[PDB]
Write an enzyme that holds these catalytic residues in place. Structure first.
Site: not given
Ligand SMILES: *[C@@H]1O[C@H](CO)[C@@H](O[C@@H]2O[C@H](CO)[C@@H](O[C@@H]3O[C@H](CO[C@H]4O[C@H](CO)[C@@H](O)[C@H](O)[C@@H]4O)[C@@H](O)[C@H](O[C@H]4O[C@H](CO)[C@@H](O)[C@H](O)[C@@H]4O)[C@@H]3O[C@@H]3OC[C@@H](O)[C@H](O)[C@H]3O)[C@H](O)[C@H]2NC(C)=O)[C@H](O[C@@H]2O[C@@H](C)[C@@H](O)[C@@H](O)[C@@H]2O)[C@H]1NC(C)=O
Ligand SMILES: *[C@@H]1O[C@H](CO)[C@@H](O[C@@H]2O[C@H](CO)[C@@H](O[C@@H]3O[C@H](CO[C@H]4O[C@H](CO)[C@@H](O)[C@H](O)[C@@H]4O)[C@@H](O)[C@H](O[C@H]4O[C@H](CO)[C@@H](O)[C@H](O)[C@@H]4O)[C@@H]3O[C@@H]3OC[C@@H](O)[C@H](O)[C@H]3O)[C@H](O)[C@H]2NC(C)=O)[C@H](O[C@@H]2O[C@@H](C)[C@@H](O)[C@@H](O)[C@@H]2O)[C@H]1NC(C)=O
Ligand SMILES: *[C@@H]1O[C@H](CO)[C@@H](O[C@@H]2O[C@H](CO)[C@@H](O[C@@H]3O[C@H](CO)[C@@H](O)[C@H](O)[C@@H]3O[C@@H]3OC[C@@H](O)[C@H](O)[C@H]3O)[C@H](O)[C@H]2NC(C)=O)[C@H](O[C@@H]2O[C@@H](C)[C@@H](O)[C@@H](O)[C@@H]2O)[C@H]1NC(C)=O
Ligand SMILES: *[C@@H]1O[C@H](CO)[C@@H](O[C@@H]2O[C@H](CO)[C@@H](O[C@@H]3O[C@H](CO)[C@@H](O)[C@H](O)[C@@H]3O[C@@H]3OC[C@@H](O)[C@H](O)[C@H]3O)[C@H](O)[C@H]2NC(C)=O)[C@H](O[C@@H]2O[C@@H](C)[C@@H](O)[C@@H](O)[C@@H]2O)[C@H]1NC(C)=O
Ligand SMILES: *[C@@H]1O[C@H](CO)[C@@H](O[C@@H]2O[C@H](CO)[C@@H](O)[C@H](O)[C@H]2NC(C)=O)[C@H](O)[C@H]1NC(C)=O
Ligand SMILES: *[C@@H]1O[C@H](CO)[C@@H](O[C@@H]2O[C@H](CO)[C@@H](O)[C@H](O)[C@H]2NC(C)=O)[C@H](O)[C@H]1NC(C)=O
Ligand SMILES: *[C@@H]1O[C@H](CO)[C@@H](O[C@@H]2O[C@H](CO)[C@@H](O)[C@H](O)[C@H]2NC(C)=O)[C@H](O)[C@H]1NC(C)=O
Ligand SMILES: *[C@@H]1O[C@H](CO)[C@@H](O[C@@H]2O[C@H](CO)[C@@H](O)[C@H](O)[C@H]2NC(C)=O)[C@H](O)[C@H]1NC(C)=O
Ligand SMILES: *[C@@H]1O[C@H](CO)[C@@H](O)[C@H](O)[C@H]1NC(C)=O
Ligand SMILES: *[C@@H]1O[C@H](CO)[C@@H](O)[C@H](O)[C@H]1NC(C)=O
Ligand SMILES: *[C@@H]1O[C@H](CO)[C@@H](O)[C@H](O)[C@H]1NC(C)=O
Ligand SMILES: *[C@@H]1O[C@H](CO)[C@@H](O)[C@H](O)[C@H]1NC(C)=O
Ligand SMILES: *[C@@H]1O[C@H](CO)[C@@H](O)[C@H](O)[C@H]1NC(C)=O
Ligand SMILES: *[C@@H]1O[C@H](CO)[C@@H](O)[C@H](O)[C@H]1NC(C)=O
Ligand SMILES: *[C@@H]1O[C@H](CO)[C@@H](O)[C@H](O)[C@H]1NC(C)=O
Ligand SMILES: *[C@@H]1O[C@H](CO)[C@@H](O)[C@H](O)[C@H]1NC(C)=O
Ligand SMILES: *[C@@H]1O[C@H](CO)[C@@H](O)[C@H](O)[C@H]1NC(C)=O
Ligand SMILES: *[C@@H]1O[C@H](CO)[C@@H](O)[C@H](O)[C@H]1NC(C)=O
Ligand SMILES: *[C@@H]1O[C@H](CO)[C@@H](O)[C@H](O)[C@H]1NC(C)=O
Ligand SMILES: *[C@@H]1O[C@H](CO)[C@@H](O)[C@H](O)[C@H]1NC(C)=O
Ligand SMILES: [Zn+2]
Lengths: 499, 499
Positions: A326, A328, A407, A188, A93, A185
């Site tokens: 994504n 995290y 991600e 964000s 990506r 995202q």
């Protein structure tokens, strides 16, 4: 039966027990990057991340670092390909810098042919090595001209300028690119760019941060989020109506988190946790699946929440072939007041939740994710099971979508020396523990996940942090950026991919 | 009777023989700067020098240096004042960054109050120390948004955006600022920005420099020059009609050179020398004094030369209270072909002259000005008498104007160590030898020169050269930019000013 670890120590770095063969044969494995973070300004116009990092250097990172030169993937894109080839990766990506292909923002002002050629050569090189491109149209790097003309995503003028940019990308690259991401995202930019002013363009209410040049943290996040959804949806409609011959797929990128109650026997914390799902995920997924914002947002945000017309609702609903998720980390949620009349009110307060990594009985959710040296009570901790919970939730709540994990990764400190930096066992642990849970959720819950792209290919400029942290699976020497050397994590990932 | 030296060694560094008392009591002595070169990007939007240096790093300087942080006069403006106070200077020329006060370019999009406050504090601090500000509205740093919306000075839209910017400056600062400069060095942006693409925005014909994003070196310099004159003149009209109560003066800045024949007995070289005066100086001074371009330009440039309407002619003619004349060096001129049909034709070829620093009999015009290490036959040499010749010419040809010398200075290499850099006797020699001739021309020819501002207050980012050369009368350590330490030249200039 699959068992996955949640706490240190982890033993999933043994490719005898966890490897690519644990997943379906077609599953894509790779890494991710973005254009501001890797390319450098050479050969492109200026964007709002140039503007923001230059106008507000203390917001660019503690080192005042920026993307001016970074790892110089403009010059060294072949070296990026080489890392991917070494990995035997099947996906990569990357993003297209709008400012590289249309430096003047609006397509009618002309294109940069040499910029187009740069991405043609990258794409061709990837395909020659058997790597599937996943291409992000917009990874935050809006041409500065558009922000200065009309404040970018604050204004509905963005929709047609974004559409014309995307059309150029599909025209030039869609014969080879079959996986497109629209906006990185979605949560964000509205919140950090227009709420807290931590991110470009750096707008907020005056009492939130007196350095902001303009803004309103209570209203602008909602406006910007609404325009993002409309611009996204217009591009997906353009793709699916005008570029269906290309045989590709398009979707948005979400930042996902899981949320758990700070106190799992307290109804107020349980309610805050469910509000967070709605306000964090549903803000975008409600529109994308139903054409409407969540009812709790309608109720709470009131007149500050824009409406979709019936035509807009229909355009946005279903505007994806897949979702780039994504992931995290996960947070605990507890109630918090929403002071809508305060001059420092922000959109983020509307969820009525305070987020932590420690629960009411003192349990930290998982291993360290990011140390905060100015305030250690603000350290971030990770939670491998959260990827399982997120994927399960998306399947159940959001109509069994096709998902690519676009991600997933962890930083190490830029204060470490090169030998410490290459000995990145904490990154192996983070990546493997999440991959274990991702395999588990695919097998147990039948979530339609078809690939995984770790953040990041190599060390790069990290938004907000400069070069003070490293995310790469390959190491870059900032004194001589040519090489990208696989770290222990990259070497592990090579073995995971080809065990 | 005044005698001045033209060749090394110079003996005008002795303040017993040449000092401020040699000039009229009211004569202003100081130094100059510009905003891109000194401030840093903190607190401002992005401009085309940010854009250009970031997109084309090898054009920013051999070190790829840029104005991102530079000497940090955003933070250390008081230290600039301190240098001026140490000098007992009576003038300081600085520029306002348009992008600091109107980051979005067009005034209706809002102003940056904190940017306005920055210049208020500087101005107030200067006046408190008895220093007269000379303020440049536009020292090349055009907001990037304007270049991206309409290609900046290429389009007549610039006129009203420049006017509204200037109006804000007069409104906010004109109660204290009584000397305004409109556009720095009128010749430079058309030729370097739109001809050779050495300077922002970096436009040219494709075969002139394949890296240019767009342009036409044969036509665009003329368009841009024409718009500069119109924008300048609209601002001067605004000043003199709406701000007459402020009791100040306004003018353009010219880059001046003298020209001598490469062969002073060859009619063709003599003709080329006179063409150069017209094409270099008259391009702007014809319009400013007569409302028309020089006849040789009309004849040569033909349909590529824009016309002024009668209203425009009247607006431009006489649009100055004074002239800011920058002067660095003089060239020999010899004939050269003008290949108007060549794809690599540039506006600069229309003068039909080749410029050198060595004449036909092998005489170098004067001492070394700038060494060119890639090609030493391209070294620049200076000529102190040229300031006499220029001022005399302006008096005689251009209707006895009021003049301030708004830049005059010389570089030393950035390869020198700090002790060598502080021992800048070559700078004393350059400055004193020019001041000697300036006094001589005032006394002998009665040119109405009323001040002199040396380039530069301190070391800074040099357009096109990064930090590879130093121009300052005070030294800045790039590893710790806080201090500005007077060099031998600054110490000499202090003594010259207060002998
Ligand atoms: C998925 O999308 C579905 C729409 O395609 C969502 O269903 C809609 O949910 C709307 C509530 O969000 C609901 O609208 C309400 O309709 C009330 C009924 O009005 C009809 O009969 C009237 C009723 O007496 C009359 O005035 C109207 O003209 C109609 O004839 C109505 O009062 C509501 O308005 C009040 O509440 C809204 C806040 O919700 C205030 O903004 C508004 O000022 C007013 O105070 C609301 O009307 C909507 O009002 C705003 C206006 O812009 C809208 O056009 C108007 O519709 C609507 O009827 C249904 N539609 C259908 C087809 O079911 C669905 O919502 C979920 O499911 C519904 C059943 C409900 O449980 C929601 O709370 C859930 O979110 C979406 N699903 C998801 C998962 O989000
Ligand atoms: C200071 O500004 C003064 C103007 O305020 C300049 O004087 C003008 O100089 C013009 C030449 O540049 C000159 O114009 C020429 O007029 C010819 C005469 O036309 C009148 O009678 C006609 C003549 O037969 C008729 O067609 C016209 O309608 C008029 O009745 C004329 O042909 C010229 O045009 C040819 O040449 C121009 C190039 O110069 C070509 O562009 C044009 O296509 C044509 O091929 C020229 O006419 C001008 O043509 C272009 C058009 O846009 C203009 O409006 C038109 O005027 C003009 O007569 C004078 N004006 C006066 C009041 O004297 C003065 O120039 C200097 O001095 C003059 C005497 C001359 O020596 C110039 O060469 C000098 O530069 C300016 N001074 C300085 C120092 O620059
Ligand atoms: C997870 O959340 C649960 C549910 O909220 C917490 O348990 C509740 O804790 C309250 C104290 O924060 C308990 O109320 C108190 O009860 C004692 C004994 O009667 C009393 O003297 C107090 O004044 C107080 O009573 C409340 O006062 C406010 C009034 O508005 C309200 O009506 C009264 O309830 C409450 O009984 C208890 N609920 C349950 C079902 O146990 C829980 O708190 C943790 O456990 C409780 C049992 C207690 O030991 C707390 O010290 C301990 O923090 C919370 N868990 C954590 C780890 O925070
Ligand atoms: C400064 O410019 C002057 C004027 O142009 C230069 O002097 C001229 O130099 C020409 C040579 O470049 C001389 O012409 C030549 O004369 C010899 C003797 O008759 C002859 O054999 C040549 O073929 C040539 O003649 C020309 O050929 C081309 C024909 O189209 C043209 O009609 C012929 O003139 C010319 O006589 C001379 N003019 C004057 C007035 O002296 C001068 O050049 C320098 O001085 C001359 C005298 C000579 O020594 C050159 O070697 C020497 O370069 C030039 N000064 C410099 C330093 O370049
Ligand atoms: C953010 O914009 C909102 C909406 O324009 C401002 O909120 C309003 O404040 C005006 C003035 O008080 C009020 O009359 C309205 O009732 C409020 N509207 C709503 C929808 O809340 C809020 O002052 C602005 N905030 C900032 C810091 O400028
Ligand atoms: C804080 O998190 C801890 C860990 O998830 C929770 O503790 C678990 O509680 C469950 C249900 O009581 C027990 O079966 C487990 O054995 C506990 N795990 C351990 C590691 O202690 C705890 O309940 C959470 N606290 C709140 C208030 O929600
Ligand atoms: C620069 O622009 C000029 C004017 O548009 C171009 O010059 C013309 O070229 C067209 C095509 O040859 C010609 O027909 C005209 O006679 C020319 N006009 C004049 C005024 O010279 C020139 O091709 C452009 N140059 C570049 C490199 O694009
Ligand atoms: C080149 O420049 C030199 C220096 O200005 C000129 O030489 C001067 O020439 C004058 C007139 O012949 C003599 O009186 C001087 O004595 C000469 N000065 C010295 C230093 O030589 C020379 O004429 C120029 N050459 C041309 C061809 O123009
Ligand atoms: C791959 O991991 C599976 C367990 O998921 C294991 O059975 C297999 O042998 C491993 N492959 C290699 C080459 O180690
Ligand atoms: C950082 O910069 C801003 C100016 O953009 C200034 O307002 C703020 O005080 C500075 N922050 C710190 C912590 O010094
Ligand atoms: C599609 O392409 C055609 C040709 O430009 C255009 O007419 C049409 O409006 C475009 N479609 C979209 C977004 O549907
Ligand atoms: C403003 O908010 C900050 C952080 O949001 C908070 O700590 C402070 O109490 C707030 N002040 C008011 C007046 O509510
Ligand atoms: C920089 O790194 C590249 C790759 O290792 C190397 O070939 C080159 O010599 C290095 N440059 C310097 C100046 O050390
Ligand atoms: C590349 O991966 C393919 C697919 O699993 C495998 O057949 C091939 O051996 C791998 N190559 C290397 C060098 O690991
Ligand atoms: C100033 O220079 C003049 C010559 O122009 C000289 O007569 C005078 O004495 C000098 N002043 C001082 C203080 O040296
Ligand atoms: C410098 O950069 C440009 C790209 O902007 C490239 O075209 C040119 O070749 C490079 N110059 C040199 C001398 O390498
Ligand atoms: C002057 O100021 C007035 C008030 O804005 C305006 O009407 C007028 O057009 C301006 N003048 C200029 C450039 O003459
Ligand atoms: C193009 O110009 C360069 C420099 O202007 C020159 O050296 C070269 O001969 C020119 N070529 C043509 C085709 O005229
Ligand atoms: C930087 O320079 C200033 C002025 O000399 C000095 O006070 C400060 O200590 C220096 N900083 C460092 C880190 O040396
Ligand atoms: C400043 O210059 C004035 C004017 O010549 C002079 O009277 C005064 O003594 C000078 N001050 C210093 C410290 O040189
Ligand atoms: Zn930069």
């Amino acid at each position: 039966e699959i068992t996955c670890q949640e706490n240190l120590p982890f033993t999933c770095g043994n490719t005898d027990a966890l490897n690519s063969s644990s997943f379906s044969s077609d599953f894509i494995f790779g890494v991710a990057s973005s254009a501001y973070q890797i390319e450098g300004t050479i050969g492109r116009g200026l964007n709002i991340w140039d503007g923001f990092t230059h106008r507000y250097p203390n917001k660019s990172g503690p080192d005042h670092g920026n993307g001016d030169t970074t790892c110089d993937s403009f010059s060294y894109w072949q070296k990026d390909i080489d890392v991917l080839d070494e990995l035997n990766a099947t996906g990569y990506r990357f993003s297209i810098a709008w400012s590289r292909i249309i430096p003047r923002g609006k397509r009618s002002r002309g294109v940069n042919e040499k910029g187009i050629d740069y991405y043609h050569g990258l794409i061709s090189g990837l395909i020659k090595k058997g790597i599937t491109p996943f291409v992000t149209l917009f990874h935050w790097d809006l041409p500065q001209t558009l922000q200065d003309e009309y404040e970018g995503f604050l204004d509905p003028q963005i929709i047609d300028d974004f559409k014309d940019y995307a059309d150029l990308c599909f025209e030039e690259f869609g014969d080879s690119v079959k996986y497109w991401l629209t906006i990185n995202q979605l949560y964000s930019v509205p919140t950090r760019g227009y709420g807290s002013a931590l991110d470009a363009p750096g707008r907020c209410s005056p009492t939130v941060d007196p350095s902001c040049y303009a803004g309103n943290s209570s209203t602008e996040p909602y406006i910007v989020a609404h325009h993002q959804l409309l611009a996204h949806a217009k591009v997906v409609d353009l793709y699916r109506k005008n570029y269906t011959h290309q045989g590709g797929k398009i979707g948005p990128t979400m930042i996902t988190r899981w949320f758990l109650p700070y106190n799992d026997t307290d109804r107020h914390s349980i309610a805050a946790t469910e509000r967070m799902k709605e306000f964090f995920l549903g803000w975008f997924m409600g529109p994308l699946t139903n054409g409407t914002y969540p009812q709790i947002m309608i109720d709470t945000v009131g007149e500050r929440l824009p409406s979709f017309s019936p035509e807009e609702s229909n355009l946005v609903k279903g505007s994806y072939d897949f979702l780039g998720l994504n992931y995290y980390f996960t947070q605990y949620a507890q109630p918090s007041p929403n002071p809508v009349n305060s001059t420092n009110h922000t959109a983020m307060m509307d969820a009525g939740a305070k987020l932590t990594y420690i629960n009411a009985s003192g349990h930290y959710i998982g291993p360290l994710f990011e140390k905060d040296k100015a305030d250690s009570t603000d350290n971030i901790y990770y939670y491998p099971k959260g990827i399982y919970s997120v994927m399960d939730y998306f399947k159940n709540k959001y109509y069994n979508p096709l998902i690519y994990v676009t991600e997933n990764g962890i930083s190490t400190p830029g204060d470490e020396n090169r030998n410490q930096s290459m000995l990145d066992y904490t990154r192996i642990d983070y990546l493997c523990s999440h991959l274990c849970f991702l395999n588990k959720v695919i097998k147990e819950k039948d979530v339609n996940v078809k690939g995984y792209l770790a953040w990041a290919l190599g060390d790069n400029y990290e938004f907000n942090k400069g070069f003070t942290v490293r995310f790469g699976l390959s190491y870059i020497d900032w004194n001589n950026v040519t090489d990208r050397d696989l770290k222990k994590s990259g070497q592990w990932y090579q073995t995971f991919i080809s065990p």
